[PDB]
């Protein structure tokens, strides 16, 4: 009929927290173009054993 | 496993007609909807992205619309270019393809000319009969074929082919293979088809007799 | 523009194995994830697998999963495909394709297709076709008109090409699509039409050519 | 303060499709359910379309139900309005609104109004005016005072300008509102008062204008 | 258990704008909604702003709509108020509180607030404050009983604490809570009744400490 | 905008009472309402929800009751550390309190002591004069204070300052500062403070001569 | 199919802690959140902690919150449960469980459970058994029916093993779960019924073994 | 949080039974329910979800009903598979179980054999005597055993264990062990088990004299 | 591809002003965007992003604010080193820059000084003719320049060149040029540049006769 | 601290190519990515490609994809643009930037630009600027002050210097932006205003300086 078109807005405001846990299959599967493009200062800094 | 289910499954349109196909999901799906042509022999290409979204290159007289669990696409003016056959895919939960709809020439009726071939003497050597029943050149597609054979009806030994739209005059043509043991085959003595087609007032039927 | 070729795809008998590529160019291949998607005309078109543009996360069809191993070469740039455990159902055309570019928040699909690669699964050995001839008479002419041909029964796999005079007789001619019989050899008929004054007088030469057994057969049909 | 800003109204052929779009700013657009109200000279105003704030919701008129679909695009604050197979009787303008906010009991309408977009439908093509001087004589004189003017008549679509003088004259004039004709042809006159005994020595030029043809005509309107 | 520190309050200017930062411990801060909560003593308590537990809703009251803006930083577990355009009613103390935990249908508040930052919004310069003796006499004795006290006149900031005889004298001390003047300058006594037969011979001095301006009083208070 | 309103805005109550206190809203809000403590320089707490939900670790002896319109906190047996201010909040449409109810520790009536200084000669040096009266341990809060400058009254020119209750005896202490420019205050002789209390039969008068 | 393998369980004192896996196979462990549920006799079922498919989100019971912790290593593909402070009512079987796929906006619960591993909490040494015989007699007979037995008594931990006759005889062993007593030494009860015409001349012995103390006791029971 | 409650605790059926039992919660949980399995000394194994959605692979004899807070789950026909425990579970807010149905098989009445044990002279010179009162074969499981020492009943110093349901007969097995120190065994001479059931229409009593 | 926009595209304000611009997004960005000063002929600076968080060594007087598609920079107090031009920009989905607003130093209304220049005898013997209307220390930059031939305005045959702000009084000096064949310019007589401006009650009118 | 300095910008002709590079100084280079940007009158800033710290991702506008190809050669800290088939509308100022240091999982933007290289893409050819006075006469003279001036017209590349009396004459004195024409050729304004009372006295010579092309003209103004 003419119910409420707006939020409560007193709703919940914290998770479910029943809400979905698992990994949605239709997510980004694209490399995000804005991500960290510099060399990472905590990285592997010795030699690997297996390289040529 | 969200099913999908497109009509109508075939539709007989003209160049110039404003085409509407619908799509209808078995749970709701939100906005995430794509259609997707594809042309016989080739590879399907995007059409809609997000349920309304058109896709760069893709021309303005496409265009989406719907939500939830019904959704259609609409052609505002049909082109040559866009016969071709049109899926929706939900993308909401993993990826479900609907049925297809083929969008088909459309042109005056034509009635089909009936012709029928019997089994050669090299097959009557090898083992096997083929008895061949040939519709050519009829408008709309539907039709119906009955083998009788000595006025019994054959079932579960015949196989059809049609052809798709002749790139001419539209029309279609269909074949008709019917398959029999040589000792099957030589039990008989009539072989006709028997052929219904909404252009034909009373039914077709051509038929020989074995060894004429 | 951006460009897939599919490669590898045959015949192979039912239980084997079989290894599909996709070559990828025209456009980055190691910033998008790929899918793999067939269509069967027994099922239509039917999603198969998915990868990340890393290959950390991977998705397969239920009627698929366990036999089936998506994979991917980003320093090729090649898509991979292996199919264990084939069953008579896993007969179709497969293509891979590109998921389009969009939101983070967003779902995704496929915006480019490959050119696709047939796949047949059948126990079938390979074999040359029978051909018979079509024989027109009178109880294949109306008015003006008669109709002869060519059936192509009993061959795998496919395809066969058909001619009529050595291809100088195109006009009204209709090769049908093959069907596949309950023995798995596939079967088609080839027919043309043609003046009813000519018969007797105007050869009529239907040549059947198969690559994979290098079958050439040029069998003449002549009335009775 | 609250703002709304429609657009992608115009002249549509019958039987083709639109999309009308209505940017909010000023308030929280996904918290708040939206209306879609028309207002034509013929019906007046007339409420069109009703969604939800999350979109769970949708109403629409009788006389639009089956062809308008409202949607909206809370990730980018936009209102649509897809109208398909549109009828001549649609001509109007279209405001996007907003529900006011109230108790939880409450029945709800709207309190801001958006700006308005037009939407004709007509089959008429896109045509210049015909620019006919309405020429001042003893029967257009009453005392020190007569009247000329100019006929800008059949031209496609609205709206078009009138100016007298390039503009240098107007005080005393009057363009009337324009009316739509049987033909689907738009027509209009604009008259100025001049002082009688300036006649034949004061030019008189009418500057008709015409944006959606690029159409700009100065008629010289002489006594006879 | 819970925890809550609000940090960033002070004495500001008004026009200018201000931070305040609610640090949350002893709970997972990122699922869960947060309120905004001022208290004044001219207006009471009174609610200022709440945030979903994604940042996804936020709302205001209607005397800082526009001007104040709620944030928060799930990966630092932090909450913002940025406060730009302040008046000088926005003087109050700004508590963080975190929504309880309830049904899905149910409405909901606050069930943990913060230990709270006092934002004090004035035009006043920092000044240290005046200290005048109270001095006993005549006519502050009644019987065996006399009143002293000092008078802390002028000051701002706050706060400014006030001992006796170095803190050796709190028996019987009433320091009255500090009134703002029209000035905009802070004022408050503070008071000691001693027995009046100890008057001429103890010393009593009031020790005025004022640490935004570093300041260090020690007034002696001597009889008439 | 939701009114809220307590009452009573002040009740003297004593240790072991049945405290009941009310607070109304200017429309329906249900049950949508909650009951807070805040004690003197520390933070509120929460201590019923839904009008009649008790919050975990809160005490039996408090409840509370009420719907629409009305509602009613109960305190069955008064505890001294229950002595604080207790706030109602509808949050049925945002969010607001009502004034707040203190619950004050009834005592016996005691009367104020009353003391009176003048202005230092260095704040009079310094332009300025400060006349202050002080009433020490009363009880109860109510009481009047008048200003009479040469048996006229004055209006606007004060400010009162009151402490909360002493922990010691629960009384209260009050200042009076009247604040007056140096011409202004040597413009004139007699400064009085008259003061009225429950426990007083006639009025107590200070004053001062300026220069005595 | 779906597997889910649980270790580290065992007997630890109170107070001390102990550090629960569960490993997965059969599935994309990264791609599904779990859950850790106890079963233990006094509480019966009862949820202990739950982890999304990343780790963003955990939550957990209001009897463990503080104590327990719940983790992953997607790269082990691994589950852990590290609990600390532990008390005698935490004693039960563990279980990881792993979430169903739904939809997006449904509610989770799980549904393939693990093996389960048994933690039991207890300040009780390791303590061999007492075997002591439950001797047949005339008040234990009715008709040519007797029966005799075993008590294993004052035992700890979990579990004994109790055989007849190395095994040979089992038709009418009738062994009863153990119970805990006040002191936290378990104790049980096996038992058989015999031809009363057998008594004095087959030999019956009870072999118990208790593997956690290497403790093997062969009891002869004798009628009297 | 939410309360669970299963009826009833134990059902005695047979193969081919329409079983149907209940579940409540405290309050509202919508459609949020599941249903688990559990056979003895095994892991529980998923059934129904969404209160009536059939998991794959479960046979369609189960089947489930309910909303709010009322929820049913029905076996058609009990099979020889299905005898095991039953748990329903809300998810509507955090997870909470009932305490489990168990399905128990209906047989015939079986009266219990009663025997008793005197603690062994090793055990008595262990310093503890511990006397054990048997009831061997007997359905259904609810009987009642009493110690009773030289006419008096004990309370607080017995332990009962009971096994589960025989695979050949479906008949239970109780044993009951009553524990004293050496001092206390032998401050007496008389001790009893006196054991009722429904199949006994007097009380059995065993008992023995000490020493004897 | 996300549009930014910036408001106002052109903001005069003064030393010690409050200062706040505007930046919108087409579609929801969340946090990610930065806000860039440039000054003319110089490189860029970075000033703020993530929306709020200041870069290492910009001062303390600018902040900003905003999340989702709306997003604002204030500068408290404005100081002489701020008159620059900043831009925001995007990066949620690749980089968009805005249009970039520039803060005008504000003054007092100043009208504009104009002269016309006739094209020089040796230009006219090149084959060309530019006549130059020069509006000379004006303020604000906003004013229009119509060319008149023989009372005919003219269109699509000027180009117009501005000043940037002079540094020692913040006026601006405007150019236009007038370019005409010598054939073009010989078939009139009488060219005239019209000046208008907030600042003039009345337009200005320079012009010349041909020859003269 | 950080620099940057590009270099390879100048003018070219559509179709052909050209290569920019940016050398870095001041920090380490080889561990950040960088951003080439360019800016236009036309269209402001706009982003043209980005590489990461070890070139394995490269991203580019969607205007300039498949015609420019950015790299870096970290060995000689060097980043590099190379630019085919240039079209008309790429004439911009370019500079090199340098991505800014964040968190693991934040989205990345430039921190420090270069200083920038002109790229003007033109067909036009190198060509000395026609010099014409600007004499001042009773038409350009208001009051006490007249205004005189030079044109410098049809030249190309850009840039010009203007000078008035070889330096000496500086106080008012405005050289135009230049503007570039439909004919490709660049064309500017340099204005002076001094007292009417010196005109036909004090000499006024504008020099003009191209060093492209070495031209230097010192043209004299004289009145009229």
């Known amino acids: 009929p003419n119910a409420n078109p707006n939020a409560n807005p007193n709703a919940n405001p914290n998770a479910n927290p029943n809400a979905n846990p698992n990994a949605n299959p239709n ?4 490399a995000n173009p804005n991500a960290n493009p510099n060399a990472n200062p905590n990285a592997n800094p010795n030699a690997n054993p297996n390289a040529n | 496993d969200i099913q999908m289910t497109q009509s109508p499954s075939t539709l007989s349109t003209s160049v110039g007609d404003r085409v ?5 999901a078995s749970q709701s799906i939100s906005n995430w909807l794509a259609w997707y042509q594809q042309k016989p022999g080739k590879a399907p290409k995007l059409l809609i992205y997000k349920a309304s979204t058109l896709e760069s290159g893709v021309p303005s007289r496409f265009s989406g619309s719907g939500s939830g669990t019904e959704f259609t696409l609409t052609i505002s003016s049909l082109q040559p270019d866009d016969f071709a056959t049109y899926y929706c895919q939900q993308y909401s939960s993993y990826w479900t393809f609907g049925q297809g709809t083929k969008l088909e020439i459309k042109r005056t009726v034509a009635a089909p000319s009936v012709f029928i071939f019997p089994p050669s003497d090299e097959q009557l050597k090898s083992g096997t009969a083929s008895v061949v029943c040939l519709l050519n050149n009829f408008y709309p597609r539907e039709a119906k074929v009955q083998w009788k054979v000595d006025n019994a009806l054959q079932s579960g030994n015949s196989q059809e082919s049609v052809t798709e739209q002749d790139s001419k005059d539209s029309t279609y043509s269909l074949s008709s293979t019917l398959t029999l043991s040589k000792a099957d085959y030589e039990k008989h003595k009539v072989y006709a088809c028997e052929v219904t087609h909404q252009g034909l ?3 077709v039927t051509k038929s020989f007799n074995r060894g004429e | 523009q951006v460009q897939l070729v599919e490669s590898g795809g045959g015949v192979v008998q039912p239980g084997r194995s079989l290894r599909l590529s996709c070559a990828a160019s025209g456009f980055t291949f190691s910033n998008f994830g790929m899918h793999w998607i067939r269509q069967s005309p027994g099922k239509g078109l039917e ?9 950390s996360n991977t998705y397969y069809a239920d ?3 366990g036999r089936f191993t998506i994979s991917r070469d980003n320093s090729k740039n090649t898509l991979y495909l292996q199919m264990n455990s084939l069953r008579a159902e896993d007969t179709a055309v497969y293509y891979c394709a590109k998921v389009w570019f969009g939101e983070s928040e967003d779902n995704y699909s496929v915006d480019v297709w490959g050119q696709g690669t ?13 051909v018979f001839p079509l024989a027109p008479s009178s109880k294949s002419t109306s008015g003006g008109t008669a109709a002869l041909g060519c059936l ?10 058909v001619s009529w005079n050595s291809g100088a007789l195109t006009s009204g001619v209709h090769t049908f699509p093959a069907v596949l019989q309950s023995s798995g050899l596939y079967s088609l008929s080839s027919v043309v039409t043609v003046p009813s004054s000519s018969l007797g007088t105007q050869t009529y ?15 003449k049909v002549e009335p009775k």
């Open chain 1, 27 to 30: 997510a980004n599967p694209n």
């Open chain 2, 20 to 24: 509407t196909i619908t799509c209808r």
């Open chain 2, 201 to 203: 007032s009373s039914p």
């Open chain 3, 47 to 55: 999603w198969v697998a998915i990868i990340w543009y890393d290959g």
């Open chain 3, 63 to 65: 009627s698929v999963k």
């Open chain 3, 118 to 130: 047939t796949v047949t699964v059948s126990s079938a050995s390979t074999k040359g076709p029978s």
């Open chain 3, 152 to 161: 192509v029964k009993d061959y795998f796999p496919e395809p066969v090409t």
């Open chain 3, 205 to 219: 030469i239907c040549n059947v050519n198969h690559k994979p057994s290098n079958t050439k057969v040029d069998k």
